[PDB]
Amino acid sequence: MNNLYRDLAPITESAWAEIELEATRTFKRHIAGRRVVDVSGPNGPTTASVSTGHLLDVSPPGDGVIAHLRDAKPLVRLRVPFTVARRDIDDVERGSQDSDWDPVKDAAKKLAFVEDRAIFEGYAAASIEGIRSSSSNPALALPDDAREIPDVIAQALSELRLAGVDGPYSVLLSAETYTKVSETTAHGYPIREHINRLVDGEIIWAPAIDGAFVLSTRGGDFDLQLGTDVSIGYLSHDAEVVHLYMEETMTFLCYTAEASVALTP
Amino acid sequence: MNNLYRDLAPITESAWAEIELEATRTFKRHIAGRRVVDVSGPNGPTTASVSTGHLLDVSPPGDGVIAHLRDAKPLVRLRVPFTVARRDIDDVERGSQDSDWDPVKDAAKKLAFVEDRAIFEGYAAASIEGIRSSSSNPALALPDDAREIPDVIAQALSELRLAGVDGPYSVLLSAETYTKVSETTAHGYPIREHINRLVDGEIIWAPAIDGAFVLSTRGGDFDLQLGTDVSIGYLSHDAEVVHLYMEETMTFLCYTAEASVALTP
Amino acid sequence: MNNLYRDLAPITESAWAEIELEATRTFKRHIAGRRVVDVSGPNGPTTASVSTGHLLDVSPPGDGVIAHLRDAKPLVRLRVPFTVARRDIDDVERGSQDSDWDPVKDAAKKLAFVEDRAIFEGYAAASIEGIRSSSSNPALALPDDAREIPDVIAQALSELRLAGVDGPYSVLLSAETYTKVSETTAHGYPIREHINRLVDGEIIWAPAIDGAFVLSTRGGDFDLQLGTDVSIGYLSHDAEVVHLYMEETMTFLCYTAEASVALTP
């Protein structure tokens, strides 16, 4: 067995397939960075860092020797534990289709929100400078009224033009911002369609971020480095409950500082 | 061309072959750790760290998330610059066999001394805990008189026996210690032969270390991790001088704390 | 699964291979009886006794009936439990090479010491008369000074000669005795080499015994009877710790009383 001690869990083959179905569906729904950034695939469990290629000065070990330390970005393992009732597990082989997997969906949404808030807003303890702090383009303010929002998106696309970046321009919208531009209409159309008629890329529902992000998907600018992808592992169980977790080992690197514009809420 | 800009050097093909011959011969003469430790081969120029497999605690990015940072040992690049007269370079194609390569030999000896002092005595700025500080066995004192030296080697082999480590036992001797046991005789034999009749391994001339080291060569205890091996690169040149360097990118990891005994001078 | 409930342990395939590697290496280092005695191989888990071939008198079940009870030596199961941290188990699949297996090494050393103290010093509760009490040759005293030790080994070999036993003579040395004859020298050689030049067999490091043993390895004199060999089994686990054990089911029989000389410390 591997570090996910899944053979030790009192979960059947069918109940495992239903848990991982709810996990993959909820994670894919709530993730937004993986649709725009480059994803360096799962390198394995023995991957601990990403080489940045840079040299760091260190004090020399002796005289006449020049010493440089190789810079690397360490990967962070993000674990979201969740609790699953054993009665819902046992009901699956009896043919139930309404087994309670809301804690699986809450943990998949939490792991998706943590990964996207690390890519876009930064995780400083894991040395992840997000897209917002790496952005050399000036930050726009999202207006309060939704009609003025496609204006400020057009100002965000003028800054990508002034920076010299081509590629399909995609827009990442926060949840409270996406609701604002979907529930408000103009000329028989929601405001979100007005932003669709400004960019050649996709309008992304990004429920973890704050504000908005306009960025380029030409490639080579933003790198999500996965050591291991999203896995479900087992912790412990009593008679009523199996304790599980959602894991992910990742780091995020921004290479191009001018390929994005961040917008404040 | 690569980062060793050797095509830009005013050094001929024959003079390059004579420089690298003096570099490899002097480095192999003065290195001692590579004869006892395990050498993980040159992984390439893009290798910046070695995964230790451990997890480090970090502050969580949010609530209900457990975050762990992957531990890694960064590699250190050690560069020893050296100066070669251009007249010695030009003499090689004229058929000279006494071209002055003493600065090549001084730089190869300096890079060998830095690597061995990192493996055995530690390089703290590059987070290299050496064999001496990693050793859980108690440190012996080397006596002043050379006749009492094979006694204290036998006490160092009693501690490897008490630790439960098998394998051929090799002895690493410092330069001022190796001279002491070679220039002194007993019963028609040098003291170094008395230490040969105590261990099943090799007596190693280790001119960079202090004191002595008795350790096991069973394997899996000491790991020298090379990113790139010993290379000669070019820096600059005037009319009289080519400026070169000896490079090495390495780190050293000690896995087994009880597989060695350090002896103080 | 078998009585070693190893599928129930939260130990990965790689961490199991590292535990059993440390167990076999430490056990082979610290065992000494198996190198000199005859080892009747693992007969299986259903083996409970060894037939001695003798008859015991019992009271008859009736008149005109002679009853004899078949003598047998019962096998003893020796279990050494040990505790392994789960963080060291999880680090193995992340590629760690310094996982803490000192409790595996302490339990392997304890099981090796118990088996050798049963073979040589006897385990009376399991009806194992050891080699020392089975020896019909008179017991020598090991001297305090190490120079007089190869003299008393030569007196121990005169008693094997007086008993009529041939075969390679091997010497088993206690740990505090082996240290005494290795750390002391004579004529440019340790005292242990002086004992090598007295016997045609091997000098055995026997860290479990007291004193010394000189015996014959002609075969057919000393029988270690294994029901099952050294196995690692699983007991229980919490979140931090897996509880394991080292097991062995054995008995030891001495057939020839005159094929050994015991020496007191």
Word description of this protein:
The PDB classes it as virus like particle. The entry lists the keywords Nanocompartment, Icosahedral shell, Cargo loaded, virus like particle. The structure is cut from a larger assembly and holds three copies of chain A (265 residues). Chain A is α/β, with parallel strands linked by helices and 265 residues long. Chain A has two domains: 1-131 and 217-254, no CATH class; 132-216 and 255-265, no CATH class. Chain A is 29% helix and 32% strand. Chain A is built from seven helices and 13 strands. Chain A has helices spanning 13-30, 86-93, 102-120, 131-134, 149-163, 175-182, 191-196, and strands at residues 38-40, 49-57, 66-74, 76-85, 140-141, 169-173, 185-186, 189-190, 203-205, 212-216, 222-237, 241-254, 260-264. Chain A has a five-stranded mixed beta sheet. A four-stranded mixed beta sheet of chain A has the order 1-11-12-4. A two-stranded antiparallel ribbon of chain A has the order 2-3. In chain A, a hairpin with an 8-residue loop joins strand 2 (49-57) and strand 3. In chain A, helix 1 (13-30) packs across helix 2 (86-93) and helix 1 packs parallel to helix 3 (102-120). The longest helix of chain A is centred in the middle third of the chain and has 19 residues, at 102-120. The radius of gyration of chain A is 22 Å and the shape is flat. The N and C termini of chain A lie far apart (46 Å). At the A-B interface, strand 2, strand 3, strand 4 and helix 3 of A face strand 2, strand 3, strand 4 and helix 3 of B. Strand 3 of chain A pairs antiparallel with strand 4 (76-85) of chain B.
